[PDB]
Design a protein around this ligand. Structure first.
Ligand SMILES: N[C@@H](CCC(=O)N[C@@H](CS)C(=O)NCC(=O)O)C(=O)O
Ligand SMILES: N[C@@H](CCC(=O)N[C@@H](CS)C(=O)NCC(=O)O)C(=O)O
Ligand SMILES: CC/C=C\C[C@H]1C(=O)CC[C@@H]1CC(=O)O
Ligand SMILES: CC(C)C[C@H](N)C(=O)O
Ligand SMILES: [Mg+2]
Lengths: 569, 214, 214
């Protein structure tokens, strides 16, 4: 049960128990997993009198490339348990690359647990610094409308979807947050761009009680407020006449909004009367809801260049920093949210995993062995190592973080990085230049509509005979199908090489399926990435999917605003 | 050459077959007519008259877990079912007893009963599979880094997942895929791929045992 | 210091106490009010909520037979309950299983129920005590040349024999003497001579159970 004092006391003790609890976490992981095949080749059996010593001395370090085959063995047809154990109910993807190739990472119900508990503690602490009213709400531009079923009839999943459409999510977060503005069906709407045309509109639906504005990233709020900033005369028109815009086309969300709507005209006088009075939006977040205690999101790392505009958007309202963890590993929680974003540090909750840190202290990098969590030295930057419920045992994520201080017996970390970058040559290309170029060439047909492309990805589908690629696009607005079909065609029309030619001209590989994506999914990608447990080097988004890419994959199938097979060819 | 007195649809006997095949032992199969139980069967087990029965060096082993364990202890050189420490074997035993009793009685209600015990049986079976799913935390197998003792204990019910999926009208996969999936990992080895007969035979037979009595 | 979660009339708890005391461990005993199952008990086994529970290294060990083999594996240098061979071990496990099934149930019927249920229970226990008599044959014990595993498993039921005799209004000794006889032989071990409560009190507990459910 989510309360204030008893839990923060338990967390305090938890961060004091740090060595014991982290140890117990390791013991919990191996006791729950003495059966892993990789562990057999490592020489494990549980117990032992030199367990920590034997684990740190006998099980080797692994990369994305080497963890790819096993979880891959887990996901496709062979619903076989391997690295962790149980064929996880959902699989996750990793930023940066695995030799340009995808990376699979298991997701467990224990992870949902990690989420509930971390959100539980952090929310209690922020409520300690920025208390909120229990009868109000919060503007959450949070999304998880997409759900995909992998090549074996097994779901693969992002942290977001695996959390929101999770069975205990509604039961789990009822006490830890301020009630959601949008109906779940609108959140889970098959069209996230218009869907949360409806998000601005829903959070905006209950402004006076919206206790805070939420997106996990500064940039999340930034494009959410550039997109908040992308619908006014229309939102007003839609809500005014009681009739939503022609922009909206999905039957479930249309049913929802129409269900909500009735024609009201004076309020119009109001929205404009306030809005542009300021010198073009300083203090915009307070302007839209005057009483939101804060703007909560990831403010360090890659969001460092987005915090200013957001700040420049949030005005005088304080900007509060976010905790760190993911579908791959959970590390730190911020329990002192009142700290501004630049100085911000986050303490690590111990039972979320078993972490180790490789020093960069020598030159670059330095041939030094991993040291304990509290064995790490203050002020130094280390490489994060993960041993958690997610299939990472003594695994190198590949990011850099600094120890600023200690919250009691558990150390404070800091992130100043960006990319986990040393790439290698791929096989989901179709040169990245070729892919980016495909998007560019096909997108102008959309640019005819006064728009710019914001993001993209792709996926190789060998379920089908013949196999067929599926290209994904994130764009600014809603348009007709004809242009999209033409876009798919051009996507095929820009894969400039002869190989593609031989293939689809023949059809040993089927026509591209263009499942155009709604706004914010790739944003969900960056968002599920910089917060992953390691360091701020988590932003190189893999452009095309080999069966082993999952987070954008969970973010692949359901929200097909439209999905088409080339009518040409 | 060791003798096995067993039943082709019996899960427990199947545990024995999975063990003897899993290690590397040539062994002979004997089918037992419960109506006309063999003389060696009457002599080996005159009390329970149960299976599987493994006559080795002239002395028989009765009960499934007993035959399997007997196998692990007799030839402990290659693929050990147990972990090195007492507590690991302990987990294997606690969970094995879980598999053979509450789990087995619940499934028994599912395939062999009508009315109330079938529904209650459905509930018991589902909660049981999720608790077993939970304890496993995330283990590819059960007892150790590879094929386990309790692995042997529950794998034979994977030949019965179909009958429960049809009789219980539940999908033990969509509600707990990881367990059935655990079973299809184990199916890739030839021990279960050759010890346990076809699933359809078991669902049909179970339907026939239902046909025979009310 | 090993912590035992025990119940005074628990033949099973007695299986644990007899096991540990037989080997050579100094332990502490905690009496349970199952009305109020202990916080560590509800943490040891949160679903079964059953004893005996032996706590070692902060690890709860559950189930009676499980607990005694746990005893064997915990201090394997002095007093083993098993012989060296796998087959002998299999025999011991087999007969222990014998002790747990029809026998325990049979006694449960003889002292816990009456009438139509009762005589069935009485013929079943006389049958069981008889097969028991036959397999005992000559051995001072059961599970080995000395004090054994299953000796631990079945010696503890000998304090309930008084109850079986009175409610049963029987005499299990005339039909099968060597068993109870063997029991008082085994009573000389300090393991059972200090772990098992008085039989009059046990008879009285049976009296309470009976007076409550008539
Ligand atoms: N605990 C035993 C139970 C064995 C058992 O009852 N087996 C059935 C065959 S599936 C049997 O022997 N039935 C005797 C009969 O039908 O009379 C085990 O796990 O093997
Ligand atoms: N098969 C069990 C039998 C244990 C047993 O009967 N325990 C009883 C002691 S009377 C118990 O703990 N009952 C708990 C309750 O029903 O409250 C074992 O040997 O561990
Ligand atoms: C326990 C938090 C799980 C939810 C995770 C996401 C949110 O909704 C807040 C950011 C967080 C991303 C992160 O902690 O890395
Ligand atoms: C777990 C979810 C609430 C958020 C997660 N960071 C994601 O974007 O996938
Ligand atoms: Mg997100």
């Amino acid at each position: 049960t989510f309360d204030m004092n008893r839990v923060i006391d338990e967390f305090d003790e938890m961060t004091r128990n740090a060595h014991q609890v982290q140890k117990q976490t390791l013991k919990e992981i191996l006791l729950k997993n003495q059966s892993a095949i990789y562990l057999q080749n490592c020489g494990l059996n549980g117990n032992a009198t030199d367990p920590e010593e034997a684990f740190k001395s006998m099980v080797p370090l692994v990369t994305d490339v080497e963890l790819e085959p096993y979880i891959k063995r887990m996901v496709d047809g062979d619903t076989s348990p391997i690295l962790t154990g149980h064929p996880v109910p959902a699989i996750s993807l990793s930023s940066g690359t695995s030799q340009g190739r995808p990376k699979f990472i298991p997701f467990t119900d224990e992870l949902m647990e990690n989420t509930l508990q971390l959100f539980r503690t952090a929310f209690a602490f922020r409520n300690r610094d920025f208390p909120i009213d229990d009868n109000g709400k919060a503007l959450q531009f949070i999304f998880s409308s997409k759900q995909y079923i992998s090549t074996g009839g097994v779901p693969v999943g992002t942290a977001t979807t695996n959390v929101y459409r999770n069975p205990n999510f509604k039961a789990g977060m009822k006490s830890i947050t301020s009630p959601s503005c949008s109906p779940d069906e609108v959140i889970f709407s098959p069209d996230v761009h218009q869907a949360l045309y409806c998000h601005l509109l829903s959070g905006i639906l209950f402004r006076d009680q919206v206790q805070y504005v939420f997106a996990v990233f500064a940039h999340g709020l930034v494009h959410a407020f550039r997109t908040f900033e992308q619908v006014w005369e229309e939102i007003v028109t839609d809500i005014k006449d009681g009739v939503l815009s022609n922009r909206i086309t999905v039957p479930s969300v249309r049913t929802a909004m129409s269900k909500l709507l009735t024609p009201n005209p004076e309020l119009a006088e109001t929205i404009r009367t306030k809005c542009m009075s300021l010198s073009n939006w300083y203090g915009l977040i307070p302007a839209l809801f005057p009483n939101a205690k804060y703007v909560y999101g990831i403010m360090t790392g890659s969001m460092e260049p987005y915090v200013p505009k957001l700040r420049h958007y949030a005005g005088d309202l304080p900007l509060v920093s976010h905790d760190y963890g993911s579908s791959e590993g959970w590390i730190a929680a911020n329990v002192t949210p009142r700290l501004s974003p630049e100085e911000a540090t986050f303490a690590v909750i111990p039972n979320l995993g078993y972490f180790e840190f490789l020093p960069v202290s020598e030159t670059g990098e330095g041939e030094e062995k991993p040291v304990g969590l509290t064995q790490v030295k203050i002020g130094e930057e280390y490489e994060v190592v993960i041993t958690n419920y997610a299939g990472l045992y003594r695994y190198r994520l590949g990011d850099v973080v600094k120890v600023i201080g200690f919250y009691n017996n558990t150390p404070q970390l800091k992130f100043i990085c960006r990319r986990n970058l040393i790439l290698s040559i791929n096989i989901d290309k179709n040169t990245e230049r070729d892919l980016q170029l495909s998007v560019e060439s096909a997108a102008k047909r959309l640019s005819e509509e006064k728009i710019e492309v914001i993001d993209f990805s792709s996926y190789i589908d060998v379920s089908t005979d013949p196999g067929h690629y599926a290209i994904f696009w994130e764009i600014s607005g809603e348009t007709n199908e004809d242009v999209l079909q033409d876009c798919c065609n051009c996507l095929d029309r820009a894969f400039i090489d002869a190989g593609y030619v031989s293939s689809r001209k023949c059809k040993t590989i089927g026509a591209l399926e263009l499942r155009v994506v709604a706004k914010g999914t790739f944003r969900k990608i960056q968002e599920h990435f910089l917060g992953l447990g390691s360091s701020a080097g988590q932003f190189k988004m893999p452009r095309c999917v080999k069966p082993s890419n999952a987070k954008v994959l969970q973010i692949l199938c359901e929200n097909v605003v439209s999905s088409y097979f080339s009518t040409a060819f | 050459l060791p003798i096995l007195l067993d039943y082709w649809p019996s899960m427990f006997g199947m545990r024995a077959r999975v063990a003897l095949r899993e290690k590397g032992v040539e062994f002979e199969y004997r089918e037992e007519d419960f109506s006309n139980k063999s003389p060696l069967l009457l002599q080996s087990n005159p009390i329970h008259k149960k299976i599987p029965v493994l006559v080795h060096n002239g002395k028989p082993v009765c009960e499934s877990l007993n035959v399997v364990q007997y196998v692990d202890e007799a030839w402990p050189e290659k693929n050990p079912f147990f972990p090195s420490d007492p507590y690991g074997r302990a987990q294997a035993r606690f969970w094995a007893d879980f598999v053979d009793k509450k789990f087995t009685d619940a499934q028994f209600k599912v395939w062999g009963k009508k009315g109330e015990e079938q529904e209650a049986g459905k509930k018991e079976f589902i909660e049981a599979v999720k608790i077993l799913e939970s304890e496993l935390g995330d283990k590819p197998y059960f007892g150790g880094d590879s094929f386990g003792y309790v692995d042997i204990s529950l794998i034979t019910f994977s030949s019965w997942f179909q009958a429960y999926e049809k009789f219980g009208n539940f999908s033990i996969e969509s509600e707990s895929p990881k367990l059935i999936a655990w079973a299809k990992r184990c199916m890739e080895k030839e021990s279960v791929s050759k010890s346990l007969p076809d699933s359809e035979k078991i669902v049909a037979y179970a339907a026939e045992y239902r046909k025979n009595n009310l």
